Design a protein around this ligand. Structure first.
Ligand code: NA
Ligand code: NA
Ligand code: NA
Ligand code: NA
Lengths: 211, 211
C-alpha cells in the first residue's frame, strides 16, 4: 500500500488503482512455503485486512491484490474470500501460483507473451491469446507485469496492443515499470551520479536489475 | 446423406463421418426465408428425421449436421432439439446464421481465418483464435469448410495446423474439398477432355468454381 496521499491524487486526477497488500515471499523455496503455512496466516491477514480497512472508500482503487510473488497457498484462498465477503464492490487479483488460481478473479500473468507459449512445469505462461480459451476458462486477462523496460527495451510493445484491441477479454496490463531505481552518489568533486546495485559495497547483489 | 455403402466402408476402414441432412437453400433472399417459415418445417423435418433413422447405428457417424447454407431459422432450432432428444450419443452441428447459433454444439465456421477477423454484419467470421474466447463462449471450434483447394491453392495451410496444435479447443476442420467436379466431354475427333460449368450450354453458370 502507498502513501495515503497517492490515492487522493488518483481520485482527483483520475487513475485506476490496484491496491496491493504488503506481502512478498519471493525468496522462499518453494515460493509458497510461508503462504501455505497456517502459522503465517495471522501476519498475512493483517497485511490484507488493514489495507482494505484503510483504503476501501477510495474510488480510484478498483481492484485489490493479495500481494506479489509468494506462490499460492491456502492463506491466499482464505484472504481472497475474506475480501470478497467484506467488500463485494471490487474484484480481487493475485498472480502467484500460475496467475489463474482460485485466489484470483482476473488472469494476471507476468511476462506472458502474445503468441508464444512458455510451458514451465506447474506454472506455465501460456500465450495470452491461448490462455483465454483454455477449456473451462472464463476470466478476463490483464497482465500484472509485462514489457520489461530494462535499459534499451520495449521491443514488440506494439504486438501486445494489437492483441489488446482485437480480443475483448484481453483488457491490457501494467508495464514493468515506471521509474529507474537508481540512487544518487558523489565522487571526490561533488558531482552527482546514478548508483545501482553493488555501488554501496552491497553483496550479494543483482546489479542494474533495479532499473 | 451418402450412398449407404459409404458408412459401412468408413466403419471398417476407420474414418469419422459428419452425416448431413439434404437441406441447402443458399439462393433464397435472405438465406433463411424457407428455414424460418413454419410451412417448410414438415419438408425439412423429413430430411433430418429420415437420415437419423437410417444412419444412427453406424459407429463412423460421430456428428449430425442440419444441412448447409440455409441461414438460421426457427425450423433449425426445432430440428436441433429433435436430434438431441432422439439420439444423445452424437453432437449436432450447423453452420448457417453465423456458425455459432443456438442450433449448433460446435462452432463450425466456413473460411474463418487464423488471425484475421472478417467482421461481416450479422454473420461475422472472427479469427478462429479470437472466436474461442468471445465473452461467454465455451464450445469447441471445428471448421466445416476451410482452405479452399481451388486450382493452385492451399497457401497458408500450415498456419491453420500450427493453431490447431496450439489451442486445445481448435480441434481442426474439413478442407473444401476432395474432388474436382469436372465432367468428361467429347469433340469431333473423340477426344476425352475435362469440362467445367458452361461447357454443356448451361446458362447461367459459375464456370471453374465447381473444381
Ligand atoms: Na480487449
Ligand atoms: Na527489477
Ligand atoms: Na487443438
Ligand atoms: Na465450388
Amino acid at each position: 500500500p502507498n502513501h495515503p496521499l497517492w490515492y487522493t491524487l488518483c481520485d482527483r486526477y483520475g487513475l485506476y488503482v490496484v491496491d496491493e497488500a504488503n506481502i512478498e515471499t519471493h525468496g522462499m523455496v518453494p515460493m509458497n512455503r510461508l503462504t501455505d503455512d497456517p502459522r503465517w496466516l495471522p501476519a498475512m491477514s493483517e497485511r490484507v485486512t488493514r489495507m482494505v480497512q484503510r483504503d476501501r472508500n477510495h474510488p480510484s482503487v478498483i481492484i485489490w491484490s493479495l500481494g506479489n510473488e509468494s506462490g499460492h497457498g491456502a492463506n491466499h484462498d482464505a484472504l481472497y474470500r475474506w475480501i470478497k465477503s467484506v467488500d463485494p464492490s471490487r474484484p480481487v487479483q493475485y498472480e502467484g501460483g500460475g496467475a489463474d488460481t482460485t485466489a484470483t478473479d482476473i488472469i494476471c500473468p507476468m511476462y506472458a507473451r502474445v503468441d508464444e507459449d512458455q510451458p514451465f512445469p506447474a506454472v506455465p505462461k501460456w500465450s495470452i491469446k491461448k490462455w483465454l480459451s483454455l477449456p473451462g476458462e472464463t476470466r478476463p486477462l490483464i497482465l500484472c507485469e509485462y514489457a520489461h523496460a530494462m535499459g534499451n527495451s520495449l521491443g514488440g510493445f506494439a504486438k501486445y496492443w494489437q492483441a489488446f484491441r482485437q480480443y475483448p477479454r484481453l483488457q491490457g496490463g501494467f508495464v514493468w515499470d515506471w521509474v529507474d531505481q537508481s540512487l544518487i552518489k558523489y565522487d571526490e568533486n561533488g558531482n552527482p551520479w546514478s548508483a545501482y546495485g553493488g555501488d554501496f559495497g552491497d553483496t550479494p547483489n543483482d546489479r542494474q536489475f533495479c532499473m
